[PDB]
């Protein structure tokens, strides 16, 4: 009934999608061929036979990444029409994604979304996976969101976004792409979950004892967070939360819609024993800064909203107790305009474990979604990066060559300045 449609944009979005849909299949007992020998149904539609099909669209402007899906283990899982590819990529250029190349497939993508949505009886909304840095993840995603907003007025849209690192980048033009896409998508997105590759790598190294974590590992970790967020819809629970509640709880002001995700416990097989892993223990782990998935310092910021999503063998009283003690602690400060900081969800289903996965099997897990004024720091950094390059007009010729105007750059930058200012204003405590 309560359907959720998943959209995977560009390389990051697609590869994360692969990891998500692998996990979903294991959780619902769906084979890679779509067969199983009302729960799954929010994510999978059903044909006449026992075949089940993901309520998903995978889009990329080049064929390579999706071609892997086509030839891979889950080739029979997806319908061919839900795997959409162009010929040439956006070449790390927002302009190409948003305009030159993106305008050729946007209609197609939207048409397929419309067909998907037509077979939903109680569409809850959209889960959009992409990156900030790529030309497709930035430019195409922005375009897509805009169209979605118009075609579907008020339905929950949630973006899981690969936010670029402070000092661990791949592309050179990343800051440009990040800034423009944030500007263009801002008024069209309800809530966007930032996650950083650096942080996840650190977690893998420090908590899981992995010398060299691969992108796969990161993807797997991300899939856990997503599963926590959607478990309330895919399973039964004691105390439940849906997609339209998160936006209400986590977003205090329209522009300030960037919470951050943190998962606990992430442990190895040998380290999983030796320690009982209580609600108190995992909750504490959540609010410790080293286990966060964005390279930022909450100790230097303030909390505006916390949402805690518990899963498995969990007792409400215990959760209450845990939260109370965390409320006391000096390292957790909340803004003065927010006496109530917590929304709490508890679901009965333990986190399910992928065969050959890095994580140990636990009785309990928790996913925290927290909105923090500390994110301002990252924005400030990104703006500074933009400034350095733009002052010299470095790379600008490319963007203009693809039909973008220089004035739009300045526009994006000023909007981000305003956003920065808005966070700071929010930060300050009430007089009288």
């Amino acid at each position: 009934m309560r359907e959720c449609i998943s959209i995977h944009v560009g390389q990051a979005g697609v590869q994360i999608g692969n990891a998500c849909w692998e996990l979903y299949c294991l959780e619902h007992g769906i084979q890679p061929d779509g067969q199983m020998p009302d729960s799954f149904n929010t994510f999978f539609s059903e044909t006449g036979a026992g075949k089940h099909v993901p309520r998903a669209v995978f889009v990329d402007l080049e064929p390579t990444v999706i071609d892997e899906v086509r030839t891979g283990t889950y080739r029979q899982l997806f319908h061919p029409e839900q795997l959409i590819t162009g010929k040439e990529d956006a070449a790390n250029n927002y302009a190409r994604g948003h305009y030159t190349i993106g305008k050729e497939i946007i209609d197609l993508v939207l048409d397929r979304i419309r067909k998907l949505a037509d077979q939903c009886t109680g569409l809850q909304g959209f889960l959009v996976f992409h990156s900030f840095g790529g030309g497709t993840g930035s430019g195409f995603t922005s375009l897509l969101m805009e169209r979605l907003s118009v075609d579907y007025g008020k339905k929950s849209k949630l973006e899981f976004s690969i936010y670029p690192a402070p000092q661990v980048s791949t592309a050179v033009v990343e800051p440009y792409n990040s800034i423009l896409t944030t500007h263009t998508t801002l008024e069209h997105s309800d809530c966007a979950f930032m996650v950083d590759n650096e942080a996840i790598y650190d977690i893998c190294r420090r908590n899981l004892d992995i010398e060299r974590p691969t992108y796969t590992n990161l993807n797997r970790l991300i899939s856990q967070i997503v599963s926590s967020i959607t478990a309330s819809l895919r399973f039964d629970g004691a105390l439940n939360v849906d997609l339209t509640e998160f936006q209400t709880n986590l977003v205090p002001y329209p522009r300030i819609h960037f919470p951050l995700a943190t998962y606990a416990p992430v442990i190895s097989a040998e380290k999983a024993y030796h320690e009982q892993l209580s609600v108190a223990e995992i909750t504490n782990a959540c609010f410790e800064p080293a286990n966060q998935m964005v390279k930022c310092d909450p100790r230097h910021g303030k909390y505006m909203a916390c949402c805690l999503l518990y899963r498995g063998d969990v007792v409400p009283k215990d959760v209450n107790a845990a939260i109370a003690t965390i409320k006391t602690k000096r390292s957790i400060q909340f803004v003065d305009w927010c006496p109530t900081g917590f929304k709490v969800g508890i679901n009965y289903q333990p986190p399910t474990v992928v065969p050959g996965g890095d994580l140990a099997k636990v009785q309990r897990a928790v996913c925290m979604l927290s909105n923090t004024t500390a994110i301002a720091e990252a924005w400030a950094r990104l703006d500074h990066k933009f400034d350095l390059m733009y002052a010299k007009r470095a790379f600008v010729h490319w963007y203009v060559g693809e039909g973008m105007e220089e004035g739009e750059f300045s526009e994006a930058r000023e909007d981000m300045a305003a956003l920065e200012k808005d966070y700071e204003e929010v930060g300050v405590d009430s007089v009288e």
Binding site: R2, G122, L239, T244, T248, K317, P339, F342, V344, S430
Partner: protein, 429 residues
């Protein structure tokens, strides 16, 4: 003969409701199929208070289940006793309320309300003499709070001469279950003050405390908490459903407990609570029960009765017991704890006794206290509301649904006035 209509709104409302029905069914000897398998004529005498008799000798709860989302409903249906309910009495939406009072009261709830009302009217018409209504819900969410209040408004308009009772789960003091709960509670209270005849305030914090400290349960489940609430609920109608020595009912209790129309917010209590080990080491007698009833640790609202005064107390006893003893106990508490009872309402303890005890126990007691201490709860909510509203935090979620600042302001002011009123009577001589 005095038929009662039961309504359940939202997740909390429905989960409590189911528990309550499980309790009532066991009490009246009704199985999960609707068939009577009891062993006493007393179990069927007043069966019509809560059950309609259907064809082929089965009984169906006079219950309406309402929610803007279909998951809780499904769970209830799949639960033990889920099959006893009338299928057409489940009235559910598809969207949900997003923890938003506005959605429950003005938007999604409003799209569903007429369908509920239709069922309600039918139920009313079924009954020869409608006693009134009991609504179970939370004040902190969107459905139970916003839609529940809407239901209350409409039902009251339709049936202004019947009594409107609510069992309201209130936001706790120390920890908040949701971020917008002050808004949701504040708005709901505004409606409740004008449209309900009596409101039982129940707080999960209190319940957990009771479970841990009194019941000695290391690991309580929500079920346990629900059970307590159900026990209280059953307690309030016991005199209406079985014979007694001094018979009370819903109207009488309201009359005794409510000296002024706005002051209809109670704090319930239940006795006796004991652990598994500790039960044999005591004796369950009237005085013991009385003492258990009159303390702060056994109140299901997170407020200390010692921080205010009792305006009135209703005590309802179930089991074979001596009325003299009860009276003596009641006098004794008044005399010894004189400072906790308002001096301008003499003999402000009301007693009821019903001969049929609950199952497993030889005697029990239910306490209804109308204390000026409840003002603390309201005050806290007002404070929390103010802190958020002064910065207009989350306001666009509600204004987006057509709501205006003025409505909020009026609601706040009304709440403040109520607090003032309560303060007034505690100090009055």
């Amino acid at each position: 003969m005095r038929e009662i209509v039961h309504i359940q709104a939202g997740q909390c409302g429905n989960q409590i409701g189911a528990k309550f029905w499980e309790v009532i069914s066991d009490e009246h000897g009704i199985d999960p199929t609707g068939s009577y398998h009891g062993d006493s004529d007393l179990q069927l005498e007043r069966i019509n208070v809560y059950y309609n008799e259907a064809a082929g000798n089965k009984y169906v709860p006079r219950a309406i289940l309402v929610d803007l989302e279909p998951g809780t409903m499904d769970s209830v249906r799949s639960g033990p006793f889920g099959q006893i309910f009338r299928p057409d009495n489940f009235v559910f939406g598809q969207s949900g309320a997003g923890n938003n009072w506005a959605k429950g009261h003005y938007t999604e709830g409003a799209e569903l309300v007429d369908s509920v009302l239709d069922v309600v009217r039918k139920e009313s018409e079924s009954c020869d003499c409608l006693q009134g209504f009991q609504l179970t819900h939370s004040l902190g969410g969107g459905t139970g709070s916003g839609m529940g209040t809407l239901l209350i408004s409409k039902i009251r308009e339709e049936y202004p001469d019947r009594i409107m009772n609510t069992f309201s789960v209130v936001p706790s003091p120390k920890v908040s279950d949701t971020v917008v709960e002050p808004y949701n509670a504040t708005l709901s209270v505004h409606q409740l003050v004008e449209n309900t005849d009596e409101t039982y305030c129940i707080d999960n914090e209190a319940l957990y405390d009771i479970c841990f400290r009194t019941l000695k349960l290391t690991t309580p489940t929500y079920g346990d908490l629900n059970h307590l609430v159900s026990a209280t609920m059953s307690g309030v109608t016991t005199c209406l459903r079985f014979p007694g020595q001094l018979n009370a009912d819903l109207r009488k209790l309201a009359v005794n407990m409510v000296p002024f129309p706005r002051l209809h917010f109670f704090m319930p209590g239940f006795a006796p609570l004991t652990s598994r080990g500790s039960q044999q080491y005591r004796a369950l007698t009237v005085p013991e029960l009385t003492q258990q009833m009159f303390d702060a640790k056994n109140m299901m609202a997170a407020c200390d009765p010692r921080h205010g005064r009792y305006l009135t107390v209703a005590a309802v006893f179930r089991g074979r017991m001596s009325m003299k003893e009860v009276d003596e106990q009641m006098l004794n508490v008044q005399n010894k704890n004189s400072s906790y009872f308002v001096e301008w309402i003499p003999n402000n303890v009301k007693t009821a006794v019903c001969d049929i005890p609950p199952r497993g126990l030889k005697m029990s007691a239910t306490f209804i206290g109308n204390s000026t201490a409840i003002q603390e709860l309201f005050k806290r909510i007002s404070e929390q509301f103010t802190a958020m509203f002064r910065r207009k935090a989350f306001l666009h979620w509600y204004t987006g649904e057509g709501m205006d600042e003025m409505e909020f302001t009026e609601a706040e002011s009304n709440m403040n006035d109520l607090v003032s009123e309560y303060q007034q009577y505690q100090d009055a001589t």
